[PDB]
Amino acid sequence: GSSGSSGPSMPASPVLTKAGITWLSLQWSKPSGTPSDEGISYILEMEEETSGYGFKPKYDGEDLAYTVKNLRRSTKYKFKVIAYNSEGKSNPSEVVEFTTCPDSGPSSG
To answer: Which domains can be identified in the chain, with CATH numbers?
Structure first.
């Protein structure tokens, strides 16, 4: 905290274009009236494993969309878009929730 270099304002929560079984296609946009530097980056976070420890980074690129991978069938997960700059990062966005499709798989074996 404390005075320092400000980053990108609060971005819009990540949407869910298509919800797969072992993948999740989220969609986020840039904040209003950007500070500077064309094309912003956003880190997709997710919390659903640790015992109230903290969110972990999943994606780290300069795209306003990503295809999550390594998931579980018929499962719920949290996700929050985090906009950051090569200089630093800002506060996370609203925590959204999504579900996946069924699978069943073989199970037995």
So the answer is: 1-109 (2.60.40.10)
